[PDB]
Symmetry: C3
């Protein structure tokens, strides 16, 4: 371990909370499911920050409660059982909860029990917009009054912030919150801790991972070895009360210079063909790549913690489509261009790169022994702001799936060929 | 956690031993194998309460010894090797043991070693009757003269106890011990702790789990939401020296009233069609369902601890068949009725309901945080009597299969598609 | 536990370091790959003694470095990336290391970083000879000038030591170091600790394991029950400075007598049909079986530790083949004789016998509770010499594959059907 590494003792002491958040930052908004994954009267169970959550759509509205019956702890989502439009019941002994408040309103075959009405399950705020269902995953005692607006946990919006973050080389990126904004993408389980997966996206030295991607050569791009920071303010940290807490990297300005050569090895690039884009990241860990893969289109990624060693990776492309025809154009270009070359292919390289780094950090070794360099100003800056502004550190799961990693149940599922997952299997 | 729950501090303190028995209650009789699973000269390895056991039938008689060579700990049952009618040898280095006493009588290629005769492996009493081989799984130092009769660990017998447990609505249920009693059924490995699997069988509020079973609607039954206790003595606890230690639930009497409605949800049943039956459980955890699925037939269930998170679930139907004709009719009805609709179908629902609850309890959370209600007088009563009358608490396995849950051998087997099991695979 | 067992307290205290070496003996030579497994410009990752290692052949020469980028710990071997003949780069962020010294010579897209040249990854000495690539797996601080010659970690050589270890009944066994010595064989991952796999090879009481092997009855052999030591010097321990550290068993002399009968079981052999051979073992745990399976042919086995519960089992046959014709005869006899009847068949029996013993020892139980006998003078003598002459005890892996056994990555791979392994999968 060299003394020339950027993550020295003082620097590391600045992001201890981050090192302690293996299970994720709780009391934040996270994408839960795509609208198409939850139809009218459909019930679905998931897990975020170690918290089991069940969702149901009733009369067009989505509700979210803890997927844990308070009687004997089974998941309510394994066998969806709802007798009324305003409740969800446990299929085992009939404990029935109010969708709106989560209160135990009754017990199917024991309507007069003294336990009724004296307790209930945790509820989770839901915000569905333009094809996506977001859920505010919170601790049991986080007050309703303190729940912030979804926007506070989403990337910086444009043109709203075009003056704060000038972007003369490309038109404004749309937000999932914008009217007529259309979302195309997917989410799948990533194997490894969410933090390590999150840090890859805005790292300007990992470009090497994409050197051989097909889209790179199909688009005749002659990529740069990487990007180097040239000044101390190459990244802007934003932490105002009203708004997202995160950072913006001044890519395509002189604060970040592209590298073309290496005299040792003897490498040197002389074809400056490429794309104009910009990355930023905000709590709870949302990446935004402006002007990617093309103008008017933007890519967003989430690394939702499920347990301390799995996460649900989201990858979407957004574009505002005012007319029925605009939607068809975007759907078409996604289907025959974006999805096969960008989401699959370009990003697949990121997928395995993240996994390859997990072993170094899981038992704690990497958080101490990693030897960061100049380009690592990016993850380091992120860790510090995340440590300062997170709304809570999730506690390890207890008495839920994922609390114990080597149960006979898990070996059974594994024997049957099932990998660690996210969506609860039913029946 | 509501103060209105039945399992308060005082109640919980009354079943600490039960909370401590994850590996099972040792020094008890357990069904090991069906007679048809062990033919003349056949050797089979199994595991109960964490204890590896090997059985062999010689001249019609079954013997059981610890499936662990005292030399270097391999399982004797993996490659059956017996040179004489009175012994079983280890296929590795030849240590040979007397089937009757378990003494080390010799070593194939080292007949004069001084270790010979100075030690041996543990023996386990066997009791085979009407198609079933029972084994008294005991600690290494439990004395032979202290082994109790099998009947002490089997359900209450009728008509012997018909006066103690009146049953005017149905004929007496037969015992596996009765002459001409015929057994039909099966046992399979269940994933999760034995205690949680055991408590489901006699719970009168889980009826909801069967609301959709095919047999229920094929037999025009209009089930009750559940059953509620009406008096403090709705369950009779029996604990006399000579006899089984357990409890009898006074089903189909004043003490247990069927629930027909729930005003909150607006539910209400008006078709009282069903079956007459009665459940009781005795240590080590044997369920008896009288008059099920039909008169003169009785169902018995065991949840034999294998390790602390797997158990062997037994499900059998018994009926006395004095003549060859009676046996054919019972075999036929089992094959084309009981098996497909009852053992499979009705009980399969219980199988998955048990599993769904295991995660809440494995790490200990559920044993403290569960919020039991009125109908839970059943499991609570069982945990108390079990705590008071068990003949021992099995210690965790050491140096045996299951002692460690994440060995490379287990990952290899899992990769090959093999789930956690019970019967040792040979060769 | 009987007091008549050979491994009494005093004896056990003589091999504590061996009990402590679950991860293996480090600072020793080990077979890494067969020459055919690493062609010109090919890169391959492996793991020995918990240490991740990557090899590459350049201009005919093989180099080995630690398969762990010092930046953020990914394995360099997962996506082979080399820009020059004298280096190997990390495919993630471009850290580049010198093959010869392991020094960090540059960073592709950050050639001026202050970290460059101030550190590097560990290098491992390589000795390739007659088809086998050996690697000196050492601790990070083991001096280059202290690396001993490969021969010190290889079995005793003949005729060099024919006078020291007289063998009138068979011609001298060739060494992998001999000119024109040809190697044929294979290595595969073994499931369980290396020590338990290693001790089986030179045990003279496990002969029973091969009683049914096809080659035994195809060769009309009437095997002995086993062999017993007759004198205290039945094993010669060698520990001179210049040379291998190990032991030679005086098989086929009166110090080891074959057993023909067992009066207790009534067994007795009358047909002394067999083969002449002799076993010896040297650190780090290499077996040599002289005159096996035929004259002029010798079998060597390694049990290379990968982690503390997996090892790479090597099984090779060596014969000196001066002419092109001699090589074809050996290749032929291996292909249609040795491989099918000896490597597979005879040795497959040893493979499963080793596995069956692993559970007793992994949690520590067996290392204390095993009850060894007279024939165990063999493993006991080996444990003592190993404890005394090992060049170091490998420390548990940290921040590398194998450091944590139940990661979601391991469950993913297992779910996909992949067993624990050795060679790193690429892409
Ligand atoms: S576990 Fe849900 S009602 Fe009993
Ligand atoms: S392990 Fe059984 S005789 Fe050696
Ligand atoms: S992990 Fe290897 S260069 Fe970053
Ligand atoms: Fe990338
Ligand atoms: Fe049931
Ligand atoms: Fe052998």
């Amino acid at each position: 371990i060299s003394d020339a590494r950027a993550n020295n003792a003082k620097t590391q002491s600045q992001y201890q909370p981050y090192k302690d958040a293996a299970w994720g930052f709780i009391n934040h908004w996270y994408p839960a499911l795509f609208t198409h994954e939850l139809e009218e009267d459909q019930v679905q169970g998931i897990q975020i920050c170690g918290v089991p959550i069940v969702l149901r759509r009733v009369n067009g509205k989505v509700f979210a409660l803890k997927d844990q019956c308070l009687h004997r702890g089974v998941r309510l989502s394994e066998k969806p059982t709802c007798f009324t439009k305003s409740t969800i019941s446990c299929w085992y002994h009939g404990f029935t909860f109010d969708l709106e408040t989560g209160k135990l309103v009754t017990i199917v075959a024991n309507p007069e029990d003294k336990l009724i009405g004296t307790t209930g399950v945790t509820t989770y705020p839901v915000h569905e917009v333009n094809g996506m269902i977001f859920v505010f995953v919170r601790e049991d005692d986080f007050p309703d009054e303190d729940v912030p607006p979804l926007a506070h946990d989403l990337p910086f919006r444009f043109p709203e912030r075009s003056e704060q973050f000038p972007h003369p080389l490309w038109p404004s990126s749309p937000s999932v919150l914008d009217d007529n904004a259309v979302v195309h993408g997917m989410h799948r389980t990533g194997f490894g801790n969410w933090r390590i997966a999150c840090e890859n996206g805005f790292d300007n030295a990992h470009i090497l991972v994409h050197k051989d991607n097909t889209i790179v050569h199909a688009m005749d791009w002659v990529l740069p070895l990487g990007l180097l920071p040239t000044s101390d303010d190459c990244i802007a940290v934003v932490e105002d009360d009203d708004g997202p807490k995160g950072m913006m990297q001044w890519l395509f300005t002189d604060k970040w210079a592209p590298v073309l050569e290496n005299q040792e090895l003897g490498l040197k690039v002389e074809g400056l063909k490429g794309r104009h884009y910009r990355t930023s990241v905000v709590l709870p860990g949302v990446l935004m790549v402006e002007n990617w893969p093309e103008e008017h289109v933007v890519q967003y990624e989430w690394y939702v913690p499920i347990t301390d060693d799995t996460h649900e990776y989201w990858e979407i492309l957004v574009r505002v489509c005012p007319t029925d025809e605009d939607r068809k154009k975007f759907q078409y270009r996604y289907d025959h261009m974006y999805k096969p070359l960008c989401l699959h292919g370009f990003n697949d390289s990121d997928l395995y790169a993240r996994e390859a780094m997990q072993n170094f950090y899981y038992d704690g070794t990497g958080w101490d022994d990693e030897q960061l360099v100049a380009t690592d100003i990016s993850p380091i800056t992120w860790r510090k702001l995340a440590s300062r502004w997170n709304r809570g550190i999730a506690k390890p799961g207890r008495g839920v799936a994922g609390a114990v990693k080597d149960t006979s149940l898990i070996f059974k599922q594994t024997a049957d060929g099932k990998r660690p997952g996210y969506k609860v299997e039913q029946i």
